[PDB]
Design a protein around this motif. Structure first.
Motif, short mmCIF file in Angstrom:
data_model
loop_
_atom_site.label_atom_id
_atom_site.label_comp_id
_atom_site.label_asym_id
_atom_site.label_seq_id
_atom_site.Cartn_x
_atom_site.Cartn_y
_atom_site.Cartn_z
N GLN A 1 -9.08 -5.71 7.06
CA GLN A 1 -10.29 -4.92 6.95
C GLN A 1 -11.44 -5.79 6.49
O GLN A 1 -11.24 -6.88 5.95
N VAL B 1 0.84 -1.19 0.00
CA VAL B 1 0.00 0.00 0.00
C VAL B 1 0.88 1.24 0.00
O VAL B 1 1.91 1.30 0.69
N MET C 1 -3.93 4.13 -0.87
CA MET C 1 -4.66 3.89 -2.12
C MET C 1 -3.93 2.78 -2.86
O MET C 1 -2.91 3.02 -3.51
N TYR C 2 -4.46 1.57 -2.77
CA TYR C 2 -3.87 0.38 -3.38
C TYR C 2 -4.71 -0.02 -4.58
O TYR C 2 -5.81 -0.57 -4.42
N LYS D 1 -10.95 -2.28 11.28
CA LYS D 1 -9.61 -2.33 10.72
C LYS D 1 -8.62 -2.69 11.83
O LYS D 1 -8.81 -2.31 12.98
N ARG E 1 -10.05 -8.74 3.91
CA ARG E 1 -8.89 -8.59 3.05
C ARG E 1 -7.69 -8.18 3.89
O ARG E 1 -7.82 -7.40 4.83
N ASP F 1 -7.27 0.60 -6.99
CA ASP F 1 -8.39 1.53 -7.00
C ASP F 1 -9.13 1.54 -5.67
O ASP F 1 -10.24 2.09 -5.59
N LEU F 2 -8.55 0.95 -4.63
CA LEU F 2 -9.20 0.78 -3.34
C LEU F 2 -8.56 1.71 -2.32
O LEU F 2 -7.34 1.68 -2.13
N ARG F 3 -9.38 2.53 -1.68
CA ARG F 3 -8.93 3.41 -0.60
C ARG F 3 -8.77 2.57 0.67
O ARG F 3 -9.76 2.15 1.27
N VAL F 4 -7.52 2.32 1.07
CA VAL F 4 -7.26 1.41 2.18
C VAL F 4 -7.31 2.20 3.49
O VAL F 4 -8.15 1.93 4.35
N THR G 1 -14.15 -6.47 3.89
CA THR G 1 -14.32 -6.17 2.47
C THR G 1 -15.80 -5.94 2.18
O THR G 1 -16.61 -6.87 2.31
N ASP G 2 -16.15 -4.72 1.82
CA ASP G 2 -17.53 -4.37 1.50
C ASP G 2 -17.92 -4.88 0.11
O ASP G 2 -18.98 -5.49 -0.05
#
Ligand SMILES: [Mg+2]
Ligand SMILES: [Mg+2]
Ligand SMILES: [Mg+2]
Ligand SMILES: [Mg+2]
Ligand SMILES: [Mg+2]
Ligand SMILES: [Mg+2]
Ligand SMILES: [Mg+2]
Ligand SMILES: [Mg+2]
Ligand SMILES: [Mg+2]
Ligand SMILES: [Mg+2]
Ligand SMILES: [Mg+2]
Ligand SMILES: [Mg+2]
Ligand SMILES: [Mg+2]
Ligand SMILES: [Mg+2]
Ligand SMILES: [Mg+2]
Ligand SMILES: [Mg+2]
Ligand SMILES: [Mg+2]
Ligand SMILES: [Mg+2]
Ligand SMILES: [Mg+2]
Ligand SMILES: [Mg+2]
Ligand SMILES: [Mg+2]
Ligand SMILES: [Mg+2]
Ligand SMILES: [Mg+2]
Ligand SMILES: [Mg+2]
Ligand SMILES: [Mg+2]
Ligand SMILES: [Mg+2]
Ligand SMILES: [Mg+2]
Ligand SMILES: [Mg+2]
Ligand SMILES: [Mg+2]
Ligand SMILES: [Mg+2]
Ligand SMILES: [Mg+2]
Ligand SMILES: [Mg+2]
Ligand SMILES: [Mg+2]
Ligand SMILES: [Mg+2]
Ligand SMILES: [Mg+2]
Ligand SMILES: [Mg+2]
Ligand SMILES: [Mg+2]
Ligand SMILES: [Mg+2]
Ligand SMILES: [Mg+2]
Ligand SMILES: [Mg+2]
Ligand SMILES: [Mg+2]
Ligand SMILES: [Mg+2]
Ligand SMILES: [Mg+2]
Ligand SMILES: [Mg+2]
Ligand SMILES: [Mg+2]
Ligand SMILES: [Mg+2]
Ligand SMILES: [Mg+2]
Ligand SMILES: [Mg+2]
Ligand SMILES: [Mg+2]
Ligand SMILES: [Mg+2]
Ligand SMILES: [Mg+2]
Ligand SMILES: [Mg+2]
Ligand SMILES: [Mg+2]
Ligand SMILES: [Mg+2]
Ligand SMILES: [Mg+2]
Ligand SMILES: [Mg+2]
Ligand SMILES: [Mg+2]
Ligand SMILES: [Mg+2]
Ligand SMILES: [Mg+2]
Ligand SMILES: [Mg+2]
Ligand SMILES: [Mg+2]
Ligand SMILES: [Mg+2]
Ligand SMILES: [Mg+2]
Ligand SMILES: [Mg+2]
Ligand SMILES: [Mg+2]
Ligand SMILES: [Mg+2]
Ligand SMILES: [Mg+2]
Ligand SMILES: [Mg+2]
Ligand SMILES: [Zn+2]
Lengths: 56, 118, 119, 142
Positions: free
Chosen positions: C116, A41, A46-47, C29, C98, A49-52, C118-119
């Motif tokens: 986290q 990450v 931002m990994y 998280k 995930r 397209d996913l906001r981590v 995963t939604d």
RNA sequence: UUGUGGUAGACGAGCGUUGUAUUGGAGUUGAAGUCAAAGCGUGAGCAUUGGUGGAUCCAAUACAAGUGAGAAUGCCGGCAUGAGUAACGCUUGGGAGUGAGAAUCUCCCAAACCGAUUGACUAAGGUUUCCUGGACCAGGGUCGUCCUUCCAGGGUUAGUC
RNA sequence: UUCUCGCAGUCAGACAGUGGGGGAUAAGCUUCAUUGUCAAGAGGGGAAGAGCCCAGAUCAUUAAAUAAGGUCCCCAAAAUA
RNA sequence: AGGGGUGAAAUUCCAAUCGAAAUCCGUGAUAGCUGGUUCUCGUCGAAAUAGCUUUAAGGCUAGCGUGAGAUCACAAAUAAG
RNA sequence: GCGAAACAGUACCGUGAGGGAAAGGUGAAAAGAACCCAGAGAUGGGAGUGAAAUAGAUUCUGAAACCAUAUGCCUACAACGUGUCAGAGCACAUUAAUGUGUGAUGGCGUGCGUUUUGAAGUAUGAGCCGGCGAGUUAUGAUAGCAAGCGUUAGUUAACCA
RNA sequence: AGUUACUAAGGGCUUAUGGUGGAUGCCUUGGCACUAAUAGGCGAUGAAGGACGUGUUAACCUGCGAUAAGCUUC
């Protein structure tokens, strides 16, 4: 057990010849451009397209 | 009067170090090992001057021996013929002739071969 | 060598998994080590799929894993899981969590990981 | 044209710093910064500060382009040590040597910078020989 | 002409260091020191040039010695090798915050050990190590924004103890 | 190599040939007499070896003749009968 | 309280030390025993033997070296008889 | 040189008597670096003062061992007291010298002191570098060499000026 | 089929540079040994040596002693 003869300054470097470091593979983030080590990450959380995580 | 040593030890030590220049590691760095190597190297140089005088003679003998066997004559008889004919030439110059002047070396062998001794 | 530390005993491992899974269910998280997240993920997924029926037997099964957290108790974490979190994953064929790898720690160089939902 | 930056009495050991310095010698500016920012070593967040300061005083003080800078030489010289007494067993004692390194980073704009250094060495040698010849001429003149 | 291997040893001739006495000479236009170089001697040894250095030094003849370092499991100081090796001396997870930087600091929730004790009151001893704020030269076997470390200020009240 | 004077060092020796003692005609044993070497002596032969054989290194020469020993190759140098 | 103390006694203990503490002084004790002893060149160059020795790993004298002087032949060496 | 050139009988060691160190030098003058840049800061790079800042508080000169960087040469079928004598190729040009740096390859080659009949030694001593470290002084005797004075010679000691 | 270079993970040699270190050289409000004089003691009228305290002045050193970084007189 201990060395009965002192090891010169050449055998020392020959053994250290394998102690060199390796450059970790790096890539470019797709949203901010800064370099991040691969498969991890970035600093913005931002990994892909996913906001981590929230931005730093 | 307290005489203090300085520039006396270092100068005579650096002379030995300068002589032992081009050695392997500590053999050129430390004064003690450098001094031992220079003495040993001097002994080697002395012995190999004598050994050079003998080894180069052997090499000339080998070359001259080979140059003769191509013509059917041997070294042991070539020198004998040289003596009986009064010809006095170094094996060095004779080998130099056989490598540089084949025709004139062949001329010397032809005269020693058959011509009347003296 | 003697008077050694107790060590990463089996009981310690189970308690560690319990604490992380309770926290990840409470907040959502967890920033831990990668090898600990990769072990807590199994228990997290197992708890979520078993909490999909919402019968008293399933509450008794979950209570052997949940622990008290700051944001929820052991009884309100139950309501959060069975009424808010688990109903969301009602037709997802597994993989509710995930694990992604962050950078190395400054004092350990160990690989961190964020776990986290995963939604 | 070499710009440089220095740091005296760095806590890192020279042995553990040369391993990181060898990863940046000959590298471009941006790539060297990128490599050093993601290496999990202690002597990576200190060479990075020295490198950044060196870039700053190369493009501000000495007036360099900034897109041609490459790490010319990054080395960790031996710094002053600190002696402590570690208490051993059975009443004995040993000496712990806390090692320090003098870090210095140097970057240039010209990719042929070694030639000028060899040229200066040659100029010094030539001046010595020239002095000897003028002295010889003076000796013969008298 | 006869000679010139050599330990213990005997004899003879010299080199070098420091200072003193007589003479002469060089030196901020750069002395000693110190480094380098492809020089001169039979040997101790002696020059030339260039860099650094910033104030004394050189030659001759005599004299007086704390006058010559490779070895003493020699003394002192520095630095290697072993080797980035052994070791780091009984206790976990997460959330939030500070901070330029956090496994190590603060708070909270748990978790694990003590519980005839790791709990509480004191004698002896220690002598400010006690409280507050700040700092991260050094010490803390890692880290540190933190400490029993350092800085500044403050703290010990008896007719009955 | 005799005489006088000054200054020493040495008082643990080793091996080879020859004549013996002790030992068992054993010892790289031990104790004597004598000739040599090493000690304090390099070089060549003995494959390598302190003492055996040839000899005695003032320094340089990429000159020549020889001693012990040797001349199929290693390794310089031979042929006939 | 130390050519002393204490000891249900082992040469125990007497400040991590006890066949007799620790420290300072005589003291730079003595050591026929180890180790070390610092620049150069040239000439010459030994001995490991005899006697005595409470002497045998030491010492003295003689023998062998070196420096100076004397002895020219009657002295000393090499061959023949 | 007194143990002590500095705040030394101090720090420190020991219950005590007692034992007992190391450490000096900026510049003529602090004129001790305002200010800018990077950094959290120390600090570094510029600027400025100064003759000199490679004299910057780490403060006269700065050696070797030791640790790194680089021009040139060589090195991954090779038995090595690491050198010596020959010897190609490569790269340069000097205290102009049948020059210097490296050395594919060939011949030869078991360290230095000590003590021993005999040490490459499976005997011993030294990890390396630098400094220090062991035939002196006083009073007499003998002998060699040289000078002064000499055949009723030669020479003073204490003491006095 | 035959003879062939480039490789340098690293190392070796020469030279140059940088860093740790304080040897050598120059110097010294310091020591040592003496010469020429002076003097050869202090204390119950409180000694030698210490503790404590004293600043417009952080500590230390030095001076001083409740008249306390100084008081009087010539
Ligand atoms: Mg190296
Ligand atoms: Mg390794
Ligand atoms: Mg000396
Ligand atoms: Mg259990
Ligand atoms: Mg203890
Ligand atoms: Mg060490
Ligand atoms: Mg001689
Ligand atoms: Mg003089
Ligand atoms: Mg000079
Ligand atoms: Mg001396
Ligand atoms: Mg050591
Ligand atoms: Mg190491
Ligand atoms: Mg190992
Ligand atoms: Mg291991
Ligand atoms: Mg380990
Ligand atoms: Mg611990
Ligand atoms: Mg732990
Ligand atoms: Mg319990
Ligand atoms: Mg308690
Ligand atoms: Mg305290
Ligand atoms: Mg507190
Ligand atoms: Mg605080
Ligand atoms: Mg720390
Ligand atoms: Mg009351
Ligand atoms: Mg005998
Ligand atoms: Mg005998
Ligand atoms: Mg016999
Ligand atoms: Mg017999
Ligand atoms: Mg017999
Ligand atoms: Mg025998
Ligand atoms: Mg002997
Ligand atoms: Mg011989
Ligand atoms: Mg032989
Ligand atoms: Mg001779
Ligand atoms: Mg012949
Ligand atoms: Mg013959
Ligand atoms: Mg042949
Ligand atoms: Mg008695
Ligand atoms: Mg008994
Ligand atoms: Mg005891
Ligand atoms: Mg003594
Ligand atoms: Mg005795
Ligand atoms: Mg002779
Ligand atoms: Mg004899
Ligand atoms: Mg005899
Ligand atoms: Mg004896
Ligand atoms: Mg005698
Ligand atoms: Mg005390
Ligand atoms: Mg500067
Ligand atoms: Mg320094
Ligand atoms: Mg300096
Ligand atoms: Mg090869
Ligand atoms: Mg093969
Ligand atoms: Mg072989
Ligand atoms: Mg060979
Ligand atoms: Mg060779
Ligand atoms: Mg060999
Ligand atoms: Mg010697
Ligand atoms: Mg012996
Ligand atoms: Mg023996
Ligand atoms: Mg051996
Ligand atoms: Mg032994
Ligand atoms: Mg011995
Ligand atoms: Mg040893
Ligand atoms: Mg030494
Ligand atoms: Mg006389
Ligand atoms: Mg490399
Ligand atoms: Mg190299
Ligand atoms: Zn990003």
């Amino acid at each position: 057990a201990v060395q009965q003869r002192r090891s010169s300054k050449h055998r020392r470097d020959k053994r250290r010849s394998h102690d060199a470091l390796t450059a970790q593979a790096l890539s470019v983030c797709q949203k901010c451009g800064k370099k991040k080590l691969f498969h991890r990450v970035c600093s913005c959380g931002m990994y892909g397209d996913l906001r981590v995580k929230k931005a730093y | 009067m307290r005489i203090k040593g300085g520039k006396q030890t270092r100068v005579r030590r650096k002379k030995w170090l300068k002589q032992a220049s081009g050695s392997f590691g500590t053999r050129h760095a430390s004064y003690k090992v450098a001094k031992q190597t220079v003495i040993q190297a001097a002994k080697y140089a002395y012995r190999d001057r004598r050994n050079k005088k003998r080894d180069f003679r052997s090499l000339w003998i080998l070359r001259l021996n080979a140059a003769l066997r191509e013509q059917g004559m041997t070294y042991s008889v070539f020198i004998n013929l040289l003596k009986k004919h009064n010809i006095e030439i170094n094996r060095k110059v004779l080998s130099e002739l056989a490598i540089k002047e084949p025709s004139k070396f062949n001329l010397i062998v032809q005269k020693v071969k058959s011509e009347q001794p003296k | 060598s003697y008077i050694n530390k107790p060590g990463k005993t089996s009981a310690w491992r189970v308690m560690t998994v319990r604490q992380q899974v309770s926290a990840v269910l409470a907040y959502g998280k967890i920033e831990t080590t990668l090898k600990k997240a990769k072990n807590t993920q199994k228990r997290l997924d197992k708890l979520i799929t078993l909490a999909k029926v919402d019968n008293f037997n399933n509450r008794r099964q979950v209570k052997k894993w949940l622990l008290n957290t700051n944001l929820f108790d052991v009884d309100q974490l139950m309501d959060h899981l069975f009424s808010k979190v688990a109903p969301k994953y009602e037709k997802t064929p597994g993989g509710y969590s995930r694990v992604l790898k962050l950078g190395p720690r400054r004092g350990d160089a160990t690989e961190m990981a964020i776990l986290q939902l995963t939604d | 044209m070499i710009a440089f930056a220095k740091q005296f009495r760095v806590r890192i050991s020279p042995q553990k710093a040369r391993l990181v310095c060898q990863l940046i010698v000959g590298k471009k500016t941006a790539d060297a910064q990128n490599i050093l920012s993601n290496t999990p070593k202690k002597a990576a967040t200190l060479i990075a500060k020295l490198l950044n300061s060196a870039i700053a005083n190369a493009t501000n003080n000495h007036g360099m382009n900034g897109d041609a800078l490459y790490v010319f030489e990054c080395v960790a010289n031996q710094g002053p040590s600190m002696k402590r007494t570690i208490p051993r067993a059975k009443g004995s004692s040993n000496m712990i040597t806390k090692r320090s390194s003098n870090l210095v980073v140097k970057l240039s704009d010209n990719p042929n910078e070694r030639q000028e250094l060899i040229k200066q060495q040659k100029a010094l040698v030539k001046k010595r020989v020239e002095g000897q010849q003028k002295a010889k001429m003076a000796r013969q003149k008298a």
